[PDB]
Protein backbone atom coordinates (compact mmCIF):
# COMPACT_ATOMS: atom_id res chain seq x y z
CA UNK A 1 0.00 0.00 0.00
CA UNK A 2 1.46 3.39 -1.13
CA UNK A 3 1.12 6.93 0.24
CA UNK A 4 -1.76 8.97 -1.26
CA UNK A 5 -1.34 12.59 -2.35
CA UNK A 6 -4.21 14.70 -3.64
CA UNK A 7 -4.10 18.18 -5.08
CA UNK A 8 -6.91 20.64 -4.50
CA UNK A 9 -6.44 23.39 -7.14
CA UNK A 10 -8.25 26.70 -7.10
CA UNK A 11 -7.80 30.47 -7.18
CA UNK A 12 -8.87 30.69 -3.49
CA UNK A 13 -9.66 34.34 -3.94
CA UNK A 14 -10.35 34.34 -1.14
CA UNK A 15 -10.63 31.06 0.74
CA UNK A 16 -14.12 30.52 2.23
CA UNK A 17 -15.68 28.28 4.82
CA UNK A 18 -16.71 26.05 1.99
CA UNK A 19 -13.14 25.42 0.93
CA UNK A 20 -12.12 24.85 4.55
CA UNK A 21 -14.77 22.17 4.90
CA UNK A 22 -13.65 20.37 1.76
CA UNK A 23 -9.97 20.40 2.69
CA UNK A 24 -10.69 19.10 6.19
CA UNK A 25 -12.86 16.27 4.76
CA UNK A 26 -10.11 15.44 2.23
CA UNK A 27 -7.39 15.53 4.87
CA UNK A 28 -9.11 12.61 6.64
CA UNK A 29 -9.17 10.41 3.56
CA UNK A 30 -5.75 10.88 2.03
CA UNK A 31 -2.22 10.93 3.44
CA UNK A 32 -1.23 14.32 1.93
CA UNK A 33 -3.34 17.21 0.70
CA UNK A 34 -1.83 20.03 -1.36
CA UNK A 35 -3.81 23.25 -1.51
CA UNK A 36 -2.71 24.41 -4.97
CA UNK A 37 -3.32 28.12 -5.51
CA UNK A 38 -3.42 29.03 -9.18
CA UNK A 39 -1.38 32.17 -9.58
CA UNK A 40 -3.58 33.68 -12.29
CA UNK A 41 -0.83 35.29 -14.33
CA UNK A 42 -3.24 36.42 -17.07
CA UNK A 43 -6.42 36.08 -14.97
CA UNK A 44 -6.45 38.93 -12.47
CA UNK A 45 -7.20 37.88 -8.83
CA UNK A 46 -8.33 40.37 -6.21
CA UNK A 47 -5.88 39.05 -3.62
CA UNK A 48 -2.22 38.36 -4.42
CA UNK A 49 -0.66 34.94 -4.30
CA UNK A 50 1.00 35.84 -0.99
CA UNK A 51 -2.23 37.05 0.59
CA UNK A 52 -4.08 33.93 -0.66
CA UNK A 53 -1.52 31.47 0.63
CA UNK A 54 -1.43 33.23 4.00
CA UNK A 55 -5.19 33.26 4.33
CA UNK A 56 -5.24 29.56 3.51
CA UNK A 57 -2.41 28.68 5.96
CA UNK A 58 -4.18 30.63 8.64
CA UNK A 59 -7.41 28.57 8.21
CA UNK A 60 -5.87 25.16 7.55
CA UNK A 61 -2.28 25.18 8.89
CA UNK A 62 -3.44 23.32 12.03
CA UNK A 63 -3.90 20.21 9.86
CA UNK A 64 -0.54 18.56 9.74
CA UNK A 65 -1.08 16.76 6.44
CA UNK A 66 -1.90 19.88 4.34
CA UNK A 67 0.66 21.81 2.24
CA UNK A 68 0.17 25.06 0.39
CA UNK A 69 1.72 25.81 -2.99
CA UNK A 70 1.19 28.37 -5.75
CA UNK A 71 1.25 27.07 -9.35
CA UNK A 72 0.76 28.18 -12.94
CA UNK A 73 0.79 26.29 -16.21
CA UNK A 74 -1.12 23.20 -17.18
CA UNK A 75 -2.72 21.40 -14.26
CA UNK A 76 -1.54 18.04 -15.70
CA UNK A 77 2.09 19.17 -15.56
CA UNK A 78 1.64 20.21 -11.94
CA UNK A 79 -0.08 16.86 -11.36
CA UNK A 80 2.99 14.96 -12.67
CA UNK A 81 5.52 17.21 -10.93
CA UNK A 82 3.70 16.63 -7.65
CA UNK A 83 3.45 12.88 -8.24
CA UNK A 84 -0.21 13.11 -7.20
CA UNK A 85 -2.70 10.26 -6.74
CA UNK A 86 -5.57 12.50 -7.79
CA UNK A 87 -7.00 15.93 -8.16
CA UNK A 88 -9.87 16.82 -5.82
CA UNK A 89 -12.70 19.25 -6.72
CA UNK A 90 -15.89 20.31 -5.00
CA UNK A 91 -19.18 20.21 -6.93
CA UNK A 92 -21.75 22.87 -5.94
CA UNK A 93 -24.01 23.16 -8.99
CA UNK A 94 -24.96 21.39 -12.24
CA UNK A 95 -22.74 23.68 -14.35
CA UNK A 96 -19.76 22.84 -12.08
CA UNK A 97 -20.55 19.17 -12.66
CA UNK A 98 -20.54 19.44 -16.44
CA UNK A 99 -17.36 21.54 -16.69
CA UNK A 100 -15.60 19.22 -14.24
CA UNK A 101 -16.65 16.14 -16.21
CA UNK A 102 -15.22 17.61 -19.41
CA UNK A 103 -11.95 18.69 -17.72
CA UNK A 104 -11.42 15.31 -16.14
CA UNK A 105 -11.77 13.63 -19.53
CA UNK A 106 -9.56 16.18 -21.32
CA UNK A 107 -6.88 15.78 -18.65
CA UNK A 108 -7.16 11.97 -18.77
CA UNK A 109 -6.38 12.24 -22.48
CA UNK A 110 -3.33 14.46 -21.83
CA UNK A 111 -2.11 12.07 -19.11
CA UNK A 112 -3.59 8.56 -18.74
CA UNK A 113 -2.50 8.51 -15.08
CA UNK A 114 -4.62 11.57 -14.26
CA UNK A 115 -7.48 11.10 -11.80
CA UNK A 116 -10.19 13.40 -10.43
CA UNK A 117 -12.31 12.80 -7.28
CA UNK A 118 -15.19 15.01 -6.24
CA UNK A 119 -16.88 16.00 -3.02
CA UNK A 120 -20.21 17.75 -2.63
CA UNK A 121 -20.49 20.47 0.01
CA UNK A 122 -22.44 20.27 3.29
CA UNK A 123 -25.64 22.16 2.82
CA UNK A 124 -24.56 25.07 5.08
CA UNK A 125 -21.80 25.92 2.52
CA UNK A 126 -23.63 24.92 -0.64
CA UNK A 127 -24.56 28.58 -1.49
CA UNK A 128 -21.06 30.02 -0.85
CA UNK A 129 -18.56 30.95 -3.60
CA UNK A 130 -15.47 33.22 -3.70
CA UNK A 131 -17.05 35.40 -6.42
CA UNK A 132 -20.19 36.13 -4.48
CA UNK A 133 -18.21 36.84 -1.31
CA UNK A 134 -16.07 39.38 -3.22
CA UNK A 135 -19.24 41.01 -4.43
CA UNK A 136 -20.85 41.37 -1.00
CA UNK A 137 -17.63 42.67 0.59
CA UNK A 138 -17.09 45.14 -2.21
CA UNK A 139 -20.55 46.55 -1.52
CA UNK A 140 -19.65 46.79 2.19
CA UNK A 141 -21.75 43.83 3.27
CA UNK A 142 -20.73 41.51 6.07
CA UNK A 143 -19.06 38.25 5.00
CA UNK A 144 -18.22 37.04 8.53
CA UNK A 145 -20.53 34.06 8.34
CA UNK A 146 -19.06 32.76 5.05
CA UNK A 147 -15.31 33.12 5.57
CA UNK A 148 -12.74 32.75 8.32
CA UNK A 149 -12.07 35.85 10.42
CA UNK A 150 -8.63 36.43 8.89
CA UNK A 151 -10.41 36.87 5.53
CA UNK A 152 -12.83 39.35 7.05
CA UNK A 153 -9.84 41.43 8.21
CA UNK A 154 -8.09 41.06 4.86
CA UNK A 155 -11.09 42.65 3.18
CA UNK A 156 -10.84 45.63 5.61
CA UNK A 157 -7.12 46.05 4.85
CA UNK A 158 -8.00 46.11 1.15
CA UNK A 159 -10.71 48.80 1.80
CA UNK A 160 -8.00 50.73 3.71
CA UNK A 161 -5.10 50.33 1.33
CA UNK A 162 -6.26 50.49 -2.29
CA UNK A 163 -4.76 47.15 -3.46
CA UNK B 164 -1.95 7.50 8.99
CA UNK B 165 -4.86 4.97 9.09
CA UNK B 166 -6.09 2.36 6.61
CA UNK B 167 -8.78 3.60 4.17
CA UNK B 168 -11.89 1.57 3.35
CA UNK B 169 -14.46 2.67 0.78
CA UNK B 170 -17.77 1.08 -0.05
CA UNK B 171 -19.12 1.08 -3.58
CA UNK B 172 -22.85 0.25 -3.26
CA UNK B 173 -25.08 -0.67 -6.16
CA UNK B 174 -27.51 -3.27 -7.48
CA UNK B 175 -24.91 -4.39 -10.08
CA UNK B 176 -27.65 -5.96 -12.14
CA UNK B 177 -25.56 -6.80 -13.95
CA UNK B 178 -22.05 -5.42 -13.54
CA UNK B 179 -20.84 -3.53 -16.64
CA UNK B 180 -17.55 -2.31 -18.01
CA UNK B 181 -18.38 1.02 -16.50
CA UNK B 182 -18.50 -0.39 -12.99
CA UNK B 183 -15.29 -2.31 -13.61
CA UNK B 184 -13.52 0.89 -14.58
CA UNK B 185 -14.69 2.71 -11.48
CA UNK B 186 -13.71 -0.07 -9.10
CA UNK B 187 -10.25 -0.39 -10.67
CA UNK B 188 -9.72 3.41 -10.39
CA UNK B 189 -10.90 3.31 -6.76
CA UNK B 190 -8.72 0.33 -5.92
CA UNK B 191 -5.64 2.44 -6.72
CA UNK B 192 -6.60 5.24 -4.37
CA UNK B 193 -7.80 3.46 -1.26
CA UNK B 194 -6.46 0.55 0.78
CA UNK B 195 -9.70 -1.52 0.69
CA UNK B 196 -12.66 -1.41 -1.67
CA UNK B 197 -15.92 -3.20 -0.85
CA UNK B 198 -18.24 -3.89 -3.75
CA UNK B 199 -21.54 -3.74 -1.85
CA UNK B 200 -24.37 -5.42 -3.75
CA UNK B 201 -27.77 -4.26 -2.56
CA UNK B 202 -29.93 -7.34 -2.24
CA UNK B 203 -33.14 -5.65 -3.37
CA UNK B 204 -35.50 -7.49 -1.06
CA UNK B 205 -38.52 -5.41 -2.16
CA UNK B 206 -36.94 -4.13 -5.40
CA UNK B 207 -36.85 -7.01 -7.86
CA UNK B 208 -33.45 -7.52 -9.62
CA UNK B 209 -33.13 -9.54 -12.81
CA UNK B 210 -30.11 -11.46 -11.52
CA UNK B 211 -29.98 -12.99 -8.04
CA UNK B 212 -27.59 -11.91 -5.35
CA UNK B 213 -25.49 -15.03 -6.00
CA UNK B 214 -25.31 -14.44 -9.74
CA UNK B 215 -24.43 -10.75 -9.18
CA UNK B 216 -21.66 -11.43 -6.69
CA UNK B 217 -20.20 -14.11 -8.96
CA UNK B 218 -20.27 -11.88 -12.01
CA UNK B 219 -18.54 -9.17 -10.00
CA UNK B 220 -15.87 -11.54 -8.55
CA UNK B 221 -15.21 -12.84 -12.01
CA UNK B 222 -14.48 -9.30 -13.36
CA UNK B 223 -12.69 -7.86 -10.33
CA UNK B 224 -11.38 -10.76 -8.21
CA UNK B 225 -7.89 -10.28 -9.69
CA UNK B 226 -7.61 -7.07 -7.64
CA UNK B 227 -6.37 -8.13 -4.27
CA UNK B 228 -7.79 -5.17 -2.36
CA UNK B 229 -11.46 -5.64 -3.44
CA UNK B 230 -14.10 -7.53 -1.39
CA UNK B 231 -17.63 -8.41 -2.39
CA UNK B 232 -20.57 -8.34 0.00
CA UNK B 233 -24.35 -8.34 -0.30
CA UNK B 234 -26.28 -5.94 1.98
CA UNK B 235 -29.77 -4.70 2.74
CA UNK B 236 -31.07 -2.06 5.11
CA UNK B 237 -30.00 1.52 5.49
CA UNK B 238 -26.74 2.35 3.74
CA UNK B 239 -25.60 4.34 6.83
CA UNK B 240 -25.93 1.26 9.03
CA UNK B 241 -23.86 -0.74 6.56
CA UNK B 242 -21.41 2.18 6.49
CA UNK B 243 -20.96 2.00 10.31
CA UNK B 244 -20.86 -1.81 10.43
CA UNK B 245 -18.12 -1.77 7.80
CA UNK B 246 -16.20 0.99 9.58
CA UNK B 247 -15.85 2.72 6.19
CA UNK B 248 -13.88 5.87 5.36
CA UNK B 249 -16.34 6.78 2.64
CA UNK B 250 -18.92 5.73 0.15
CA UNK B 251 -17.93 5.94 -3.52
CA UNK B 252 -20.39 6.64 -6.37
CA UNK B 253 -20.01 7.24 -10.08
CA UNK B 254 -21.69 10.27 -11.67
CA UNK B 255 -22.83 9.80 -15.29
CA UNK B 256 -25.53 12.44 -15.77
CA UNK B 257 -26.97 15.63 -14.21
CA UNK B 258 -29.87 13.73 -12.58
CA UNK B 259 -27.36 11.33 -10.95
CA UNK B 260 -25.52 14.39 -9.64
CA UNK B 261 -28.59 15.92 -8.02
CA UNK B 262 -29.87 12.69 -6.42
CA UNK B 263 -26.37 11.91 -5.14
CA UNK B 264 -25.99 15.39 -3.65
CA UNK B 265 -29.26 15.01 -1.76
CA UNK B 266 -28.40 11.48 -0.52
CA UNK B 267 -24.99 12.54 0.70
CA UNK B 268 -26.55 15.35 2.73
CA UNK B 269 -29.37 13.15 4.10
CA UNK B 270 -26.85 10.49 5.10
CA UNK B 271 -24.54 13.09 6.68
CA UNK B 272 -27.48 14.11 8.84
CA UNK B 273 -28.16 10.48 9.87
CA UNK B 274 -24.45 9.96 10.65
CA UNK B 275 -22.05 12.93 10.93
CA UNK B 276 -19.13 10.60 10.12
CA UNK B 277 -20.63 9.68 6.73
CA UNK B 278 -18.67 10.69 3.64
CA UNK B 279 -19.31 10.37 -0.11
CA UNK B 280 -16.68 10.66 -2.90
CA UNK B 281 -17.52 10.65 -6.57
CA UNK B 282 -15.82 9.66 -9.79
CA UNK B 283 -16.91 10.51 -13.32
CA UNK B 284 -16.64 7.81 -15.97
CA UNK B 285 -14.16 7.69 -18.87
CA UNK B 286 -15.98 8.76 -21.96
CA UNK B 287 -16.01 5.24 -23.48
CA UNK B 288 -18.30 4.11 -20.58
CA UNK B 289 -20.23 7.32 -20.09
CA UNK B 290 -23.29 6.03 -22.06
CA UNK B 291 -23.44 2.61 -20.33
CA UNK B 292 -25.93 1.68 -17.57
CA UNK B 293 -27.22 -1.67 -16.20
CA UNK B 294 -30.82 -0.78 -17.14
CA UNK B 295 -30.05 -0.11 -20.76
CA UNK B 296 -27.91 -3.26 -21.02
CA UNK B 297 -30.83 -5.34 -19.66
CA UNK B 298 -33.05 -3.79 -22.27
CA UNK B 299 -30.78 -4.53 -25.23
CA UNK B 300 -30.13 -8.12 -24.08
CA UNK B 301 -33.81 -8.73 -23.50
CA UNK B 302 -34.45 -7.73 -27.11
CA UNK B 303 -31.70 -10.13 -28.22
CA UNK B 304 -29.15 -7.43 -28.98
CA UNK B 305 -25.44 -7.90 -28.44
CA UNK B 306 -24.05 -6.45 -25.20
CA UNK B 307 -20.50 -7.82 -25.61
CA UNK B 308 -18.93 -4.41 -25.94
CA UNK B 309 -20.51 -3.05 -22.73
CA UNK B 310 -20.04 -5.89 -20.26
CA UNK B 311 -17.49 -8.55 -19.38
CA UNK B 312 -17.81 -11.87 -21.23
CA UNK B 313 -19.08 -13.72 -18.16
CA UNK B 314 -22.07 -11.34 -18.19
CA UNK B 315 -22.68 -12.04 -21.85
CA UNK B 316 -22.88 -15.76 -21.03
CA UNK B 317 -25.07 -15.13 -18.00
CA UNK B 318 -27.61 -13.45 -20.25
CA UNK B 319 -27.63 -16.56 -22.52
CA UNK B 320 -28.19 -18.85 -19.51
CA UNK B 321 -31.12 -16.66 -18.51
CA UNK B 322 -32.56 -16.90 -22.11
CA UNK B 323 -32.12 -20.70 -21.78
CA UNK B 324 -33.44 -21.22 -18.28
CA UNK B 325 -36.41 -18.94 -17.59
CA UNK B 326 -35.06 -17.29 -14.40
Ligand SMILES: CC(C)(COP(=O)(O)OP(=O)(O)OC[C@H]1O[C@@H](n2cnc3c(N)ncnc32)[C@H](O)[C@@H]1O)[C@@H](O)C(=O)NCCC(=O)NCCS
Pocket residue numbers: 009010011012013016017018019022038073074075076088089090091092096103107120121125126127128129130
Ligand atom coordinates in the same frame (compact mmCIF):
# COMPACT_ATOMS: atom_id res chain seq x y z
C1 LIG C 1 -9.87 25.87 -12.57
C2 LIG C 1 -8.83 26.67 -11.76
C3 LIG C 1 -8.74 28.11 -12.30
C4 LIG C 1 -9.19 26.73 -10.27
O1 LIG C 1 -10.64 26.67 -10.03
P1 LIG C 1 -11.47 27.95 -9.48
O2 LIG C 1 -10.92 29.14 -10.19
O3 LIG C 1 -12.90 27.58 -9.73
O4 LIG C 1 -11.28 28.11 -7.87
P2 LIG C 1 -12.12 28.32 -6.47
O5 LIG C 1 -11.12 28.52 -5.38
O6 LIG C 1 -13.19 29.36 -6.57
O7 LIG C 1 -12.82 26.88 -6.25
C5 LIG C 1 -11.98 25.73 -5.89
C6 LIG C 1 -12.76 24.44 -6.00
O8 LIG C 1 -13.52 24.19 -4.77
C7 LIG C 1 -14.91 24.17 -5.03
N1 LIG C 1 -15.61 24.99 -4.03
C8 LIG C 1 -15.48 26.33 -3.80
N2 LIG C 1 -16.27 26.77 -2.85
C9 LIG C 1 -16.96 25.64 -2.42
C10 LIG C 1 -17.96 25.44 -1.45
N3 LIG C 1 -18.48 26.40 -0.68
N4 LIG C 1 -18.44 24.19 -1.30
C11 LIG C 1 -17.95 23.23 -2.10
N5 LIG C 1 -17.04 23.31 -3.06
C12 LIG C 1 -16.57 24.55 -3.17
C13 LIG C 1 -15.11 24.73 -6.44
O9 LIG C 1 -16.30 24.20 -6.98
C14 LIG C 1 -13.79 24.34 -7.13
O10 LIG C 1 -13.70 23.01 -7.64
C15 LIG C 1 -7.45 25.98 -11.82
O11 LIG C 1 -7.71 24.59 -11.69
C16 LIG C 1 -6.54 26.18 -13.03
O12 LIG C 1 -6.41 27.29 -13.53
N6 LIG C 1 -5.90 25.11 -13.48
C17 LIG C 1 -4.78 25.15 -14.43
C18 LIG C 1 -5.17 25.61 -15.83
C19 LIG C 1 -5.54 24.54 -16.85
O13 LIG C 1 -4.81 23.56 -17.05
N7 LIG C 1 -6.70 24.77 -17.50
C20 LIG C 1 -7.17 24.16 -18.74
C21 LIG C 1 -6.45 22.93 -19.13
S1 LIG C 1 -6.78 21.73 -17.82
Ligand SMILES: CC(C)(COP(=O)(O)OP(=O)(O)OC[C@H]1O[C@@H](n2cnc3c(N)ncnc32)[C@H](O)[C@@H]1O)[C@@H](O)C(=O)NCCC(=O)NCCS
Pocket residue numbers: 172173174175176179180181182185201236237238239251252253254255259266270283284288289290291292293
Ligand atom coordinates in the same frame (compact mmCIF):
# COMPACT_ATOMS: atom_id res chain seq x y z
C1 LIG D 1 -28.87 3.36 -4.53
C2 LIG D 1 -28.68 1.83 -4.46
C3 LIG D 1 -30.00 1.12 -4.80
C4 LIG D 1 -27.61 1.35 -5.44
O1 LIG D 1 -27.50 2.20 -6.63
P1 LIG D 1 -27.96 1.69 -8.10
O2 LIG D 1 -29.22 0.91 -7.89
O3 LIG D 1 -28.03 2.94 -8.92
O4 LIG D 1 -26.81 0.73 -8.77
P2 LIG D 1 -25.94 0.50 -10.14
O5 LIG D 1 -25.15 -0.75 -9.96
O6 LIG D 1 -26.77 0.58 -11.39
O7 LIG D 1 -24.91 1.75 -10.13
C5 LIG D 1 -23.84 1.77 -9.13
C6 LIG D 1 -23.15 3.12 -9.10
O8 LIG D 1 -22.12 3.20 -10.12
C7 LIG D 1 -22.42 4.22 -11.06
N1 LIG D 1 -22.23 3.70 -12.42
C8 LIG D 1 -22.90 2.68 -13.03
N2 LIG D 1 -22.51 2.48 -14.27
C9 LIG D 1 -21.52 3.43 -14.49
C10 LIG D 1 -20.73 3.75 -15.61
N3 LIG D 1 -20.80 3.14 -16.79
N4 LIG D 1 -19.85 4.77 -15.47
C11 LIG D 1 -19.82 5.42 -14.30
N5 LIG D 1 -20.53 5.23 -13.20
C12 LIG D 1 -21.37 4.20 -13.36
C13 LIG D 1 -23.87 4.64 -10.82
O9 LIG D 1 -24.04 5.97 -11.25
C14 LIG D 1 -24.05 4.35 -9.32
O10 LIG D 1 -23.58 5.34 -8.42
C15 LIG D 1 -28.17 1.41 -3.06
O11 LIG D 1 -27.20 2.37 -2.69
C16 LIG D 1 -29.15 1.24 -1.90
O12 LIG D 1 -30.23 0.69 -2.08
N6 LIG D 1 -28.76 1.71 -0.72
C17 LIG D 1 -29.43 1.40 0.54
C18 LIG D 1 -30.82 1.99 0.68
C19 LIG D 1 -30.95 3.35 1.35
O13 LIG D 1 -30.42 3.59 2.44
N7 LIG D 1 -31.69 4.25 0.66
C20 LIG D 1 -32.29 5.49 1.14
C21 LIG D 1 -31.75 5.97 2.43
S1 LIG D 1 -30.01 6.33 2.12
Ligand SMILES: [Cl-]
Pocket residue numbers: 011013130131
Ligand atom coordinates in the same frame (compact mmCIF):
# COMPACT_ATOMS: atom_id res chain seq x y z
CL1 LIG E 1 -13.07 32.98 -8.49
Ligand SMILES: [Cl-]
Pocket residue numbers: 174176293294
Ligand atom coordinates in the same frame (compact mmCIF):
# COMPACT_ATOMS: atom_id res chain seq x y z
CL1 LIG F 1 -30.54 -0.88 -12.06
Ligand SMILES: [Mg+2]
Pocket residue numbers: 129130131
Ligand atom coordinates in the same frame (compact mmCIF):
# COMPACT_ATOMS: atom_id res chain seq x y z
MG1 LIG G 1 -14.87 28.86 -5.60
Ligand SMILES: [Mg+2]
Pocket residue numbers: 292293294
Ligand atom coordinates in the same frame (compact mmCIF):
# COMPACT_ATOMS: atom_id res chain seq x y z
MG1 LIG H 1 -25.84 1.53 -12.89
